[PDB]
mmCIF file of N, CA and C in Angstrom:
data_model
loop_
_atom_site.group_PDB
_atom_site.id
_atom_site.type_symbol
_atom_site.label_atom_id
_atom_site.label_comp_id
_atom_site.label_asym_id
_atom_site.label_seq_id
_atom_site.Cartn_x
_atom_site.Cartn_y
_atom_site.Cartn_z
ATOM 1 N N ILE X 172 135.519 148.746 49.370
ATOM 2 C CA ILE X 172 134.875 147.482 49.715
ATOM 3 C C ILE X 172 135.795 146.305 49.422
ATOM 4 N N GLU X 173 136.625 146.405 48.385
ATOM 5 C CA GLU X 173 137.595 145.351 48.119
ATOM 6 C C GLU X 173 138.602 145.246 49.254
ATOM 7 N N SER X 174 139.093 146.387 49.743
ATOM 8 C CA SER X 174 139.981 146.355 50.904
ATOM 9 C C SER X 174 139.261 145.790 52.125
ATOM 10 N N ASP X 175 137.986 146.150 52.289
ATOM 11 C CA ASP X 175 137.186 145.614 53.384
ATOM 12 C C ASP X 175 137.127 144.096 53.315
ATOM 13 N N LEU X 176 136.822 143.562 52.135
ATOM 14 C CA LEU X 176 136.768 142.116 51.970
ATOM 15 C C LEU X 176 138.132 141.496 52.223
ATOM 16 N N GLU X 177 139.202 142.176 51.809
ATOM 17 C CA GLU X 177 140.537 141.613 51.973
ATOM 18 C C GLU X 177 140.883 141.433 53.444
ATOM 19 N N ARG X 178 140.749 142.491 54.250
ATOM 20 C CA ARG X 178 141.146 142.300 55.644
ATOM 21 C C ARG X 178 140.095 141.524 56.428
ATOM 22 N N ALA X 179 138.832 141.531 55.986
ATOM 23 C CA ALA X 179 137.852 140.627 56.574
ATOM 24 C C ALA X 179 138.247 139.175 56.342
ATOM 25 N N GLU X 180 138.747 138.855 55.145
ATOM 26 C CA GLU X 180 139.191 137.494 54.864
ATOM 27 C C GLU X 180 140.462 137.152 55.634
ATOM 28 N N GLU X 181 141.351 138.128 55.817
ATOM 29 C CA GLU X 181 142.530 137.891 56.647
ATOM 30 C C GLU X 181 142.113 137.531 58.070
ATOM 31 N N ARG X 182 141.191 138.310 58.639
ATOM 32 C CA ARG X 182 140.684 137.990 59.967
ATOM 33 C C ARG X 182 139.964 136.649 59.946
ATOM 34 N N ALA X 183 139.319 136.321 58.825
ATOM 35 C CA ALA X 183 138.652 135.031 58.702
ATOM 36 C C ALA X 183 139.645 133.893 58.867
ATOM 37 N N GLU X 184 140.712 133.903 58.066
ATOM 38 C CA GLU X 184 141.655 132.791 58.109
ATOM 39 C C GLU X 184 142.350 132.738 59.459
ATOM 40 N N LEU X 185 142.637 133.900 60.050
ATOM 41 C CA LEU X 185 143.163 133.888 61.409
ATOM 42 C C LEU X 185 142.184 133.205 62.359
ATOM 43 N N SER X 186 140.889 133.498 62.213
ATOM 44 C CA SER X 186 139.883 132.897 63.081
ATOM 45 C C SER X 186 139.806 131.386 62.894
ATOM 46 N N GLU X 187 139.800 130.909 61.645
ATOM 47 C CA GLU X 187 139.717 129.462 61.453
ATOM 48 C C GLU X 187 140.975 128.773 61.962
ATOM 49 N N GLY X 188 142.146 129.387 61.774
ATOM 50 C CA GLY X 188 143.350 128.812 62.353
ATOM 51 C C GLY X 188 143.264 128.718 63.864
ATOM 52 N N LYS X 189 142.836 129.811 64.507
ATOM 53 C CA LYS X 189 142.677 129.810 65.957
ATOM 54 C C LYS X 189 141.734 128.704 66.398
ATOM 55 N N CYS X 190 140.571 128.608 65.752
ATOM 56 C CA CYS X 190 139.623 127.557 66.093
ATOM 57 C C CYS X 190 140.254 126.186 65.928
ATOM 58 N N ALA X 191 141.065 126.004 64.884
ATOM 59 C CA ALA X 191 141.676 124.700 64.658
ATOM 60 C C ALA X 191 142.610 124.315 65.798
ATOM 61 N N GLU X 192 143.569 125.185 66.146
ATOM 62 C CA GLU X 192 144.516 124.759 67.177
ATOM 63 C C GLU X 192 143.824 124.667 68.528
ATOM 64 N N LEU X 193 142.843 125.534 68.782
ATOM 65 C CA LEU X 193 142.139 125.446 70.051
ATOM 66 C C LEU X 193 141.310 124.173 70.140
ATOM 67 N N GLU X 194 140.679 123.759 69.040
ATOM 68 C CA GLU X 194 139.896 122.531 69.060
ATOM 69 C C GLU X 194 140.786 121.317 69.276
ATOM 70 N N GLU X 195 141.932 121.258 68.593
ATOM 71 C CA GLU X 195 142.815 120.116 68.814
ATOM 72 C C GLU X 195 143.392 120.137 70.227
ATOM 73 N N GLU X 196 143.652 121.330 70.772
ATOM 74 C CA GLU X 196 144.098 121.424 72.160
ATOM 75 C C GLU X 196 143.034 120.904 73.119
ATOM 76 N N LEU X 197 141.770 121.278 72.898
ATOM 77 C CA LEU X 197 140.686 120.739 73.717
ATOM 78 C C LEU X 197 140.610 119.225 73.600
ATOM 79 N N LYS X 198 140.738 118.695 72.385
ATOM 80 C CA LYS X 198 140.680 117.248 72.216
ATOM 81 C C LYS X 198 141.784 116.566 73.015
ATOM 82 N N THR X 199 143.019 117.052 72.877
ATOM 83 C CA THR X 199 144.139 116.429 73.576
ATOM 84 C C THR X 199 143.977 116.536 75.088
ATOM 85 N N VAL X 200 143.586 117.711 75.585
ATOM 86 C CA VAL X 200 143.493 117.897 77.028
ATOM 87 C C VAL X 200 142.352 117.068 77.602
ATOM 88 N N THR X 201 141.234 116.968 76.877
ATOM 89 C CA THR X 201 140.133 116.132 77.339
ATOM 90 C C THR X 201 140.537 114.664 77.370
ATOM 91 N N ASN X 202 141.259 114.203 76.345
ATOM 92 C CA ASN X 202 141.732 112.823 76.355
ATOM 93 C C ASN X 202 142.663 112.576 77.535
ATOM 94 N N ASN X 203 143.577 113.513 77.795
ATOM 95 C CA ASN X 203 144.488 113.360 78.924
ATOM 96 C C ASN X 203 143.727 113.331 80.243
ATOM 97 N N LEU X 204 142.739 114.217 80.395
ATOM 98 C CA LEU X 204 141.954 114.247 81.622
ATOM 99 C C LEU X 204 141.204 112.939 81.824
ATOM 100 N N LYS X 205 140.591 112.415 80.759
ATOM 101 C CA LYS X 205 139.875 111.150 80.877
ATOM 102 C C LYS X 205 140.822 110.016 81.244
ATOM 103 N N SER X 206 141.993 109.963 80.601
ATOM 104 C CA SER X 206 142.945 108.901 80.903
ATOM 105 C C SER X 206 143.413 108.981 82.351
ATOM 106 N N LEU X 207 143.716 110.188 82.832
ATOM 107 C CA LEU X 207 144.148 110.340 84.217
ATOM 108 C C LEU X 207 143.035 109.963 85.188
ATOM 109 N N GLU X 208 141.798 110.372 84.896
ATOM 110 C CA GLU X 208 140.687 110.047 85.784
ATOM 111 C C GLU X 208 140.401 108.553 85.798
ATOM 112 N N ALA X 209 140.674 107.858 84.693
ATOM 113 C CA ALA X 209 140.452 106.417 84.660
ATOM 114 C C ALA X 209 141.312 105.706 85.695
ATOM 115 N N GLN X 210 142.580 106.101 85.807
ATOM 116 C CA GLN X 210 143.545 105.491 86.726
ATOM 117 C C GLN X 210 143.273 104.009 86.971
ATOM 118 N N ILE E 172 129.360 143.165 45.264
ATOM 119 C CA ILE E 172 130.365 143.258 46.319
ATOM 120 C C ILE E 172 129.713 143.620 47.648
ATOM 121 N N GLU E 173 128.666 144.449 47.630
ATOM 122 C CA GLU E 173 127.949 144.752 48.865
ATOM 123 C C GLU E 173 127.287 143.503 49.439
ATOM 124 N N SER E 174 126.686 142.684 48.571
ATOM 125 C CA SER E 174 126.080 141.439 49.027
ATOM 126 C C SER E 174 127.128 140.516 49.629
ATOM 127 N N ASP E 175 128.310 140.458 49.014
ATOM 128 C CA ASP E 175 129.402 139.688 49.598
ATOM 129 C C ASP E 175 129.791 140.239 50.964
ATOM 130 N N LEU E 176 129.883 141.566 51.081
ATOM 131 C CA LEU E 176 130.358 142.188 52.313
ATOM 132 C C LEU E 176 129.409 141.934 53.476
ATOM 133 N N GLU E 177 128.100 142.033 53.238
ATOM 134 C CA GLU E 177 127.151 141.864 54.338
ATOM 135 C C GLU E 177 127.289 140.482 54.973
ATOM 136 N N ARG E 178 127.272 139.435 54.149
ATOM 137 C CA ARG E 178 127.435 138.069 54.629
ATOM 138 C C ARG E 178 128.845 137.778 55.137
ATOM 139 N N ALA E 179 129.871 138.438 54.593
ATOM 140 C CA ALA E 179 131.200 138.330 55.181
ATOM 141 C C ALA E 179 131.200 138.847 56.613
ATOM 142 N N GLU E 180 130.575 140.002 56.846
ATOM 143 C CA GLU E 180 130.503 140.546 58.198
ATOM 144 C C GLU E 180 129.689 139.639 59.115
ATOM 145 N N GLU E 181 128.581 139.094 58.606
ATOM 146 C CA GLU E 181 127.733 138.246 59.440
ATOM 147 C C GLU E 181 128.483 136.995 59.891
ATOM 148 N N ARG E 182 129.131 136.299 58.948
ATOM 149 C CA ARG E 182 129.964 135.163 59.337
ATOM 150 C C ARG E 182 131.142 135.585 60.201
ATOM 151 N N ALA E 183 131.660 136.802 60.023
ATOM 152 C CA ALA E 183 132.782 137.236 60.844
ATOM 153 C C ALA E 183 132.363 137.381 62.298
ATOM 154 N N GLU E 184 131.194 137.979 62.528
ATOM 155 C CA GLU E 184 130.642 138.040 63.876
ATOM 156 C C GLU E 184 130.391 136.640 64.424
ATOM 157 N N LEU E 185 129.860 135.743 63.589
ATOM 158 C CA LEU E 185 129.605 134.380 64.048
ATOM 159 C C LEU E 185 130.897 133.686 64.464
ATOM 160 N N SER E 186 131.954 133.836 63.663
ATOM 161 C CA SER E 186 133.230 133.208 63.981
ATOM 162 C C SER E 186 133.847 133.820 65.229
ATOM 163 N N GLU E 187 133.694 135.132 65.416
ATOM 164 C CA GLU E 187 134.174 135.751 66.648
ATOM 165 C C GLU E 187 133.450 135.180 67.862
ATOM 166 N N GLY E 188 132.133 135.001 67.757
ATOM 167 C CA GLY E 188 131.395 134.387 68.851
ATOM 168 C C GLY E 188 131.831 132.959 69.117
ATOM 169 N N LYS E 189 132.061 132.190 68.051
ATOM 170 C CA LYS E 189 132.545 130.823 68.215
ATOM 171 C C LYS E 189 133.917 130.806 68.877
ATOM 172 N N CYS E 190 134.786 131.746 68.502
ATOM 173 C CA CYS E 190 136.096 131.847 69.136
ATOM 174 C C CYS E 190 135.961 132.163 70.618
ATOM 175 N N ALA E 191 135.052 133.075 70.969
ATOM 176 C CA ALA E 191 134.839 133.392 72.377
ATOM 177 C C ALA E 191 134.343 132.171 73.143
ATOM 178 N N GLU E 192 133.401 131.428 72.560
ATOM 179 C CA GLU E 192 132.897 130.224 73.216
ATOM 180 C C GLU E 192 134.006 129.194 73.395
ATOM 181 N N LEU E 193 134.835 129.008 72.365
ATOM 182 C CA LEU E 193 135.932 128.052 72.460
ATOM 183 C C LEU E 193 136.945 128.483 73.512
ATOM 184 N N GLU E 194 137.209 129.788 73.608
ATOM 185 C CA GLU E 194 138.121 130.284 74.633
ATOM 186 C C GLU E 194 137.561 130.042 76.028
ATOM 187 N N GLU E 195 136.256 130.252 76.207
ATOM 188 C CA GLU E 195 135.636 129.952 77.494
ATOM 189 C C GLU E 195 135.748 128.467 77.819
ATOM 190 N N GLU E 196 135.533 127.609 76.820
ATOM 191 C CA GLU E 196 135.681 126.174 77.035
ATOM 192 C C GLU E 196 137.114 125.824 77.420
ATOM 193 N N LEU E 197 138.090 126.454 76.764
ATOM 194 C CA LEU E 197 139.488 126.227 77.111
ATOM 195 C C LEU E 197 139.765 126.645 78.548
ATOM 196 N N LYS E 198 139.236 127.796 78.960
ATOM 197 C CA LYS E 198 139.432 128.248 80.333
ATOM 198 C C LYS E 198 138.845 127.245 81.320
ATOM 199 N N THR E 199 137.622 126.784 81.054
ATOM 200 C CA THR E 199 136.990 125.829 81.960
ATOM 201 C C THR E 199 137.789 124.534 82.038
ATOM 202 N N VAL E 200 138.226 124.010 80.890
ATOM 203 C CA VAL E 200 138.927 122.732 80.897
ATOM 204 C C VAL E 200 140.289 122.867 81.562
ATOM 205 N N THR E 201 140.985 123.990 81.359
ATOM 206 C CA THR E 201 142.285 124.147 82.002
ATOM 207 C C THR E 201 142.139 124.337 83.505
ATOM 208 N N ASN E 202 141.086 125.025 83.957
ATOM 209 C CA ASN E 202 140.831 125.085 85.392
ATOM 210 C C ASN E 202 140.544 123.697 85.951
ATOM 211 N N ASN E 203 139.755 122.898 85.226
ATOM 212 C CA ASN E 203 139.481 121.535 85.670
ATOM 213 C C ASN E 203 140.763 120.713 85.744
ATOM 214 N N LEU E 204 141.628 120.844 84.737
ATOM 215 C CA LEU E 204 142.888 120.108 84.740
ATOM 216 C C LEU E 204 143.772 120.540 85.900
ATOM 217 N N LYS E 205 143.833 121.845 86.171
ATOM 218 C CA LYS E 205 144.629 122.324 87.296
ATOM 219 C C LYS E 205 144.097 121.771 88.610
ATOM 220 N N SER E 206 142.773 121.757 88.775
ATOM 221 C CA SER E 206 142.191 121.200 89.992
ATOM 222 C C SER E 206 142.498 119.713 90.120
ATOM 223 N N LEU E 207 142.418 118.973 89.013
ATOM 224 C CA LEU E 207 142.640 117.531 89.066
ATOM 225 C C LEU E 207 144.109 117.189 89.284
ATOM 226 N N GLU E 208 145.021 118.042 88.817
ATOM 227 C CA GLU E 208 146.445 117.750 88.905
ATOM 228 C C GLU E 208 146.969 117.763 90.333
ATOM 229 N N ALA E 209 146.181 118.246 91.296
ATOM 230 C CA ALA E 209 146.651 118.285 92.677
ATOM 231 C C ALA E 209 146.978 116.888 93.185
ATOM 232 N N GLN E 210 146.133 115.911 92.872
ATOM 233 C CA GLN E 210 146.358 114.534 93.294
ATOM 234 C C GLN E 210 146.133 113.571 92.133
#
């Protein structure tokens, strides 16, 4: 169970990292889309 | 440790679902950007 928790936590931190870069990517791309559409 | 593991798994499934939703959002926004970039 300790090993289970260990690799579950590894997958956890990978997941939060993924969510972080994907969220900032969405923010940047949405801002760019809005700016371009404003023209 | 079992109590920790159950809730670790539950949040792990939740984070996987959130990652899938974010990936779908990324796909939609990038398709929108590709469509808009034509003109």
